[PDB]
Structures are given as C-alpha cells and as structure tokens.
Design a protein around this ligand. Sequence first.
Ligand SMILES: Cc1cc(Oc2ccc(CC(=O)N3CCOCC3)cc2)ccc1C#N
Length: 188
Amino acid sequence: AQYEDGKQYTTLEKPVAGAPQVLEFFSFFCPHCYQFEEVLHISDNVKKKLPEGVKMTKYHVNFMGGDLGKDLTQAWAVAMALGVEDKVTVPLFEGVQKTQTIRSASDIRDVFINAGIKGEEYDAAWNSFVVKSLVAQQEKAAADVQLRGVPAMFVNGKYQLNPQGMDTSNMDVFVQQYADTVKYLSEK
Ligand SMILES: Cc1cc(Oc2ccc(CC(=O)N3CCOCC3)cc2)ccc1C#N
C-alpha cells in the first residue's frame, strides 16, 4: 500500500472517542514546532487540503519549559478565548526561541499588548474560569494520547502522523506528503 501503518502514520492502541477530527499539539519551546509554523506553515497547508469548514484544533502542551511552559498553555487558552491566535503565534515563537525575550508571564503578556490586545482584556481572560476550562481541555486532549512529544497531529482520535517516515530533502515536498497524509487519514 502507498500509505501504511508505521510509515506515514501510526495507529493508536486505544483510540480516543469524540476527539477533534484534526488535532495538533505544539509547544512554543519546541524547535520543530517553530519550523512547522514559520518555515513550513503545516497547519495552513493541511487546511487547504481538507474540505472547507472542517474543524482543525491546535493545543499547547505543558511538558516543555517547566513553569513558563505552563504559563504558555494558559496564554494559548487566552489566545483561543479571544480569537487572537493569528496575532500572537509568531511573536510568542520568536520571543521564546529567537530573541529569547520571553522569560516570565509578564513577558508573555507584553506580546499580547504589542499585538493590540488591551491590558484589561488580557488580564480578565487570564483569570477567567472560561480560560481555566480551556486549559483543562488542552491538558485532557494531550493526556488522552499519552503525549510525550511535539509537534504531533492526530486524526479522528485514531491515527498519529509520522513525519519521520517522510522525506526531508525538499521542504515543500515534505509539507505536501504531510498534508496529503492527513487528507487520506481523514477519508479513512
Ligand atoms: C523539513 C522538516 C521536517 C521535519 O520532520 C520532523 C521530524 C520529527 C518530528 C517529531 C519530533 O521531533 N518529536 C516527537 C516525539 O519525540 C519528541 C520530538 C517532527 C517533524 C522537521 C523539521 C523540518 C524543517 N524545517
């Protein structure tokens, strides 16, 4: 078969019922995640290969970066609650990995302020119980699949993408194979 278990994807031993159809996990501390966002634009290219309107979900994880890692999961919950993911993803990545100017929760907050989210708006969300359950949702989703590594993508709670089984001599061909694999898995 052109696509087979163990090559472009692996199959979860215990599938996860009611999981988001396309679910990505990442960390602002994760170097491949940085490339997946800035150099490869994986989420964008996957979306362009799936039917219009289908739900793609993207969640942050705690297991990289200790205290700041958890702050960033809460900040990502803020970003999702306010709908400003597209505004803060790049400056958070660069603040953590490129300039290394993000060292505290205050520094994370500055990224949002510079992105134009008002201070009162950020702080009210940060302390909201709506963001607490959004944090809980990100944790539960990752715990359901015993996630020990990012970047990760799961399809229908059943299939996990295997980018190590794809060729990386050409960055565009890799993004293609990844997006085409998500499509094939989604139709499975
Ligand atoms: C062209 C290209 C291909 C890539 O393929 C990848 C190879 C491996 C991973 C997974 C991984 O690292 N994990 C997960 C489990 O264990 C912890 C760490 C992701 C992407 C990565 C980057 C680029 C670029 N530029």
